[PDB]
Paper text:
Glutamine synthetases (GS) are central enzymes essential for the nitrogen metabolism across all domains of life. Accordingly, GS present across all domains of life plays a central role in cellular N assimilation under low N availability. GlnA1 is not covalently modified in response to N availability and thus represents an Iα-type-GS.
The detailed structural analysis uncovered that GlnA1 assembles into a dodecamer characterized by stacked hexamer rings. R172’ and S189’ coordinate the γ-Carboxy-group. Notably, F24 stabilizes the 2-OG via stacking with its phenyl ring. R87' and its loop undergo a dramatic flip to coordinate 2-OG and D170 of helix α3 (residues 167–181).
Author numbering:
A (entry chain D), B (entry chain O), C (entry chain C), D (entry chain Y): 2 to 447
Write the structure that this text describes.
Amino acid sequence: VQMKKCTTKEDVLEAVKERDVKFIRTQFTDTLGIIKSWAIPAEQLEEAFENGVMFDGSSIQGFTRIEESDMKLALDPSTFRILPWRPATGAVARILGDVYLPDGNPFKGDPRYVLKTAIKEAEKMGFSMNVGPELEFFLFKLDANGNPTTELTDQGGYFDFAPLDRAQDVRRDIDYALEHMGFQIEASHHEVAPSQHEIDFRFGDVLCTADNVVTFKYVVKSIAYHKGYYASFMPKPLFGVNGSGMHSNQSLFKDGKNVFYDPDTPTKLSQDAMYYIGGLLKHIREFTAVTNPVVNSYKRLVPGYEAPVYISWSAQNRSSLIRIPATRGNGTRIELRCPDPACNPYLAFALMLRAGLEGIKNKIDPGEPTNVNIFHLSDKEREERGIRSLPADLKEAIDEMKGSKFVKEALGEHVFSHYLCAKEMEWDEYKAVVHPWELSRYLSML
Amino acid sequence: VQMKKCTTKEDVLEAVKERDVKFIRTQFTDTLGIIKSWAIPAEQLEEAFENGVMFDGSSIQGFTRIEESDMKLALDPSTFRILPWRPATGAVARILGDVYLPDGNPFKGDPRYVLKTAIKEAEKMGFSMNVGPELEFFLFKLDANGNPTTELTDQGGYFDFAPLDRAQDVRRDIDYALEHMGFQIEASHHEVAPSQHEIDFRFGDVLCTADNVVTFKYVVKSIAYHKGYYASFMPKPLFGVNGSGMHSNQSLFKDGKNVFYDPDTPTKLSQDAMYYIGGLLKHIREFTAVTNPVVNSYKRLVPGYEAPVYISWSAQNRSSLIRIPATRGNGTRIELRCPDPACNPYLAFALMLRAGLEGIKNKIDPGEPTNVNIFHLSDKEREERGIRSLPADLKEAIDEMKGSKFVKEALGEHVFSHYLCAKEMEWDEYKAVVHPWELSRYLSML
Amino acid sequence: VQMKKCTTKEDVLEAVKERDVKFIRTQFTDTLGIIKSWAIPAEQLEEAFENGVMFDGSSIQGFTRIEESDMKLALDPSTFRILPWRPATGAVARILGDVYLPDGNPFKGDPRYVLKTAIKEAEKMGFSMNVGPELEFFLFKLDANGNPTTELTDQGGYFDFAPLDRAQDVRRDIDYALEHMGFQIEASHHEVAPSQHEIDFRFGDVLCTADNVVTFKYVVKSIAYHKGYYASFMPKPLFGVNGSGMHSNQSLFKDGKNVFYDPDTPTKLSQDAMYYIGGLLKHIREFTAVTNPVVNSYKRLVPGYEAPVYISWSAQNRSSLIRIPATRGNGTRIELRCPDPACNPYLAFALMLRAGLEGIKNKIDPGEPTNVNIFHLSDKEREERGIRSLPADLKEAIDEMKGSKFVKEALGEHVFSHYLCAKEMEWDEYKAVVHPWELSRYLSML
Amino acid sequence: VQMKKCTTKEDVLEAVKERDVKFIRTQFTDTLGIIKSWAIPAEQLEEAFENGVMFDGSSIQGFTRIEESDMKLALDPSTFRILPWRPATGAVARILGDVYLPDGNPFKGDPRYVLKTAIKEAEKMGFSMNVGPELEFFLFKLDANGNPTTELTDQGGYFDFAPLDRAQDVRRDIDYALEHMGFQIEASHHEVAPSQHEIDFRFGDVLCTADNVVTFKYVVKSIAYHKGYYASFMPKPLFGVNGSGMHSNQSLFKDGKNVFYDPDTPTKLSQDAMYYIGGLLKHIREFTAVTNPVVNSYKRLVPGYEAPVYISWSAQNRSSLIRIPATRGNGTRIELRCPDPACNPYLAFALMLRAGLEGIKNKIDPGEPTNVNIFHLSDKEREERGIRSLPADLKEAIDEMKGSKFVKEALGEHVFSHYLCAKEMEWDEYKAVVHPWELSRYLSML
Ligand SMILES: O=C(O)CCC(=O)C(=O)O
Ligand SMILES: O=C(O)CCC(=O)C(=O)O
Ligand SMILES: O=C(O)CCC(=O)C(=O)O
Ligand SMILES: O=C(O)CCC(=O)C(=O)O
């Protein structure tokens, strides 16, 4: 909206000049998926495009150590975007960058570098990945200090209207801001859980899509904050209601044609689509710790009637792990329903790409589709069907990822080790906490 | 104290007559270790000694189903005891009983029956078990309604005096009450954690010891309640301070001689003592779910510098799972340090007895003792020494117990299945709870 | 009072029988001077007198490690005393003990053992030390929960009467209790600071005197607690008013004669008295960390007009480190004014004894006495007189103690190392704290 | 911005006339680094440029005595700057000045005079100093009366975005104001600690740089105040989070060439750079009391994992005292990381310049660089490498500065004596305070 997407640094400089841009937010994503930002003046942008932007990486989790901590951000001109919630006079813009070592080599601990490596691996087989993510978030009230709470903003449900849904203005302003940041909005609605909302944007290439995921998260948070609300991408902030997931629709392309499409097959799906699904189902347990990164992710991913915890695929069944929407042609896609919006999109999308590529290369059969309600099935029926489960908690997923040579190869040694160390520290802190539930259950019994 | 221990029902009736006993609390222990009590008049005691006391078992957890729920309690006269905190005029007494089916057979789901079966198994090899348990409990404040809290009664530490320890009167009254119930007090002190106390009573035969454990728990709770306090036997009611365990000292006897003693050996320990330790260490993972029954038990049993989570044995080392106090002769005993006071003493003591008997029968070598501080060791050093760990949470211990044929054989099918079902329901409820820790950690990040 | 002091275990057993003693508090002092107590029944006292009382030493600070943590307390019958604030029916008594290793050897980390070693060293030269300590304490209010505060109980001053001093009843009950515990009270009064009081008891042999110091501290604390007050032995609980010290009057005896007395000298002081003063003045900097153990001790020991921070000796001058009261004959004594009631009396008295013995053995001249008000002197005047200062804070005293071979020899390796480690941890925690004084001084200015 | 930097008094008068400037804030820096300001009308500015501005120096700390207290401020036209937060109509401008005695001689107690003396000393050897300081500050809430607090404005961390960082508007307005006051902003971001922010401006000549440091501090404070916040340059306002330092990047120049650069050397550093580092490392202990002036500075400078307390140098290691950024050519610089923003920039920069000049003149070898994480090293490993430590507290640094003839020569007798006297009074007041930490630690124990 009102600003054509720049491709080169010259277009970025012209846009900075003509849109009265004064501050440039040089941005990158850390290992755990948190956006890292610092502001440089627009006068320094020409020097930043040539020499990079130097920063200390020892204060960034998963990055370099304190002994060798100097790092450089190489700005990507195509990611240049003006923030619409910032003032228009002396405008503020963001540029995403790639993290580099001072010797000119890319930082292998950069998640964007991991996604680029997965993209290069796909291109070596002639494949290009398109990802359409569906992010759910909660809008909660802020307290008197403007700090986040879990207080509900409405008691609405799925597709609710009227004053049952009380965030039409917030979703409207989010949609406007996203269109200003180059998003193509498709739909926006109230989700199943109270105060839960989904805003769908158009799919794109996987690198641009992961950039869009981190951008979408911080844009939604900023717009919610300026209206007096808090936007939460916690997987399960509230008990008893629906959690927030990130349904990941993915499609493969080769020579301009959708790889997953085959008009000759009765199901209109190619053998390569089945191989991609088989690789995803084979490897999903090994990087559930990445697609579902936090302890709360497994408060969302509990067996029940909501969470895609059962490893399976189907066409229309929404109780299966993998869903294949009936769209055919260039729109043929595979939806992974396990991940939540707390995951690092670069690492998660890279790992799904690598799992699908491994399935295609090794010709992994996905098995028979599960067309029944797996939630209504019992453990005996699921055991007879061979329907396995995702890791039940963060420790189990850490253990699954630790022994995975596939995840270690796909992520690189730095990302693998630092991610596992951070998750291990998080679980070790969590596992010692005496929760109020235990006091309510045991104190007056024991 | 003041009442000689009755052995026959005639002695019980004489004591009821001469001590003005009006109410008899017929008591038993349920599957999870909770004392179950109801009061009959002393006039009905003569009929209750011949026909038993009939009760409904469908309202007792782990007991019979609602279709066949009539149950009979067969009173054991040796357990007759007058409660000292109850009024002396129209005195109140308790009798423990064995649960029987209406057809005259013992209820196989009775934990006391399980312990008696373990005792019979030991006697078939000529062994008799003596157990000395060391129970820790917390003394918390009561609220305005007299309900339990976790509010500290003092900030004292181990062996603290003065007003640093603020429960000398409560411990004094508990000691008096326990001596009235036939306990032989050995020591009483403030424990390591704030508001934590240990009262040690003399060892005895394992059946009387388990009776003493349940009696001690409810006596401490009653005495604390009448002084305006709450006695908590929760394994870990507070974070950051010491949890409460139940160190289980056990000794075996045959022909009047301590089996674990051997004056000829350099370490003054018989080969049967080593076999008992080997069986305990081999099987302890399979009934950690019994010795540590609740979710909070594994908030106590965390790797660190306090909890005996590492499967090992030693003589003086208190970082080992099994300790051998230097007492020899008839006082030679083996101390298991994993269990907490929330466990069912009948099932726990029966399982330790059966594990030790399996070790003696199969000549299981316990391996080399670990004389170093295992807490100061790293995971690499513990892996090099082969030092295994106890189950990290209740789910892992449930899984370990489920596949154990030893635990299933020792407990019987009814106790095994009902205990596992109750623990599974407990963990399934716990695992879905969104804790305030997750809100504090993730809400303003995600 | 009413109970003649027992000397043998038979006398103790007779006193237990005839005074209805039911609970025995087996007591000892840890490395930092804190009384450690646990209660055994009086029925176990005969066995405890023969085999000792076993306890875990790993939970006691400065004691053994967790790998070899079994310890035995050898009860001292002469220390047997009935606590008067405890009920008379089912009376409670205390017995102090010596800590022994299980192999029958004394524990070298026991402070009582350190004092006994100092006594043996003095006896090898024919000397016996008598110590008269003068303890000051504060009387503060209890809060609603009965926890310590610093709220003043009165605004009185030195030797104040009327309702200016509001603790005549507390001092009266303390005096009664102390007389019941074998103390010979000499005087009791309100001290200089508000809510500050001094109760003087008769001197005695140094081992009995240190026993009396720890006994006095916990007796005063208990009596204050039962009247709704808190007795604080903090060196400096309040700023701007007088701190609490422990003036240590010491006298040496040989062949029944006071060593420090000489009727032929003009000052009526023997050369051995001057040698003792010289040794004390030479070594006092090396164990100031023992006589003044905590950080708050040096908030008392600040240069000013109250604290004896200047290393000097004199006869009547109370601004000197060492004061010689004009009493002569058998009452000739040397008063060390630096220590506070927070010190371990066993270690402190042992170190003063060893410093004086080193002065006598090495013939150390104490120099000229300082008969002027050293507080009114300037730093230049004190520098010309050669008047050195005590360590300014706990860190400086720790550093002085570290390099002292005299203190290491006098305390033994275990006590030296563990005491220094505890003090180092205490100072390392203290030195990082951002105090509210810094916020008041710097926040609005920097 | 919008006002070209004046060089002569004629340019200042023209700017005053054309910008409607009515009030001139004649400003100077006192001995401890606090800006001292008073307002004269712009009509008096022509007379002030000729005769100076008379003021009373007895009310300024570190300045003249009350007997001879008349002082004159000689205005520096190059420092003329219009304050942007003051009204534009009847504009308010500042002029920095040099403090002079009435006899026309410069006041030797003026810190700006000390820096000018250091500059003259450097120019006598042909050197010119360029300093780039990196200042960290905290943004705290104001109370109801607009007084400073320590209440956090956000819980963000290093390089945080979104509403995690809640001070983008404050940083934006600070950047605008600094650009108005002649600063060239380079970067601005949220720092590691919560509510902590860093704004980087371009380096310059050392005199202009120290002027910029004091200007930056009061500009940040004014802008924060007008938005309802408090800007704190306190070294360690909060415990457990990162403190605020002032990393001092310095470069030397001779004949237009960076002295520290040498293309022939393998490390691209001249021998003079090593000499400068050696002089800095040799003398840093002697003026740590200047670079770290307050008691709180050593609550920041504690051994740990954050503070540069270990005397060492390296290239990329951020655990070293001295860092050498990889920039070469004219950008070669040496970063001293010990100082905090509470220091007097004139005295601090003068002392770093003099230490480096002494290193160059005396050919002081800096030793081997320390390329390992010194924070992860133990005291034994640091002692084997000869890695010394900075003074642990303000008293130790005062004692180090007392015996330094280098600091006395570099600062002059007046500044040296008055600075030491002020620091001595500060420490003497601090050392007597009974802190609440001591009450929490000792009151219930002693
Ligand atoms: O309801 C929404 O999703 C926001 C868009 C909209 O329809 C509106 O502006 O009300
Ligand atoms: O302190 C205790 O353990 C209770 C027994 C006792 O010594 C007392 O009565 O005070
Ligand atoms: O005032 C005192 O020290 C207590 C003793 C006394 O004189 C009294 O009982 O009032
Ligand atoms: O965030 C900042 O450092 C302030 C500058 C900026 O980017 C803005 O105006 O938002």
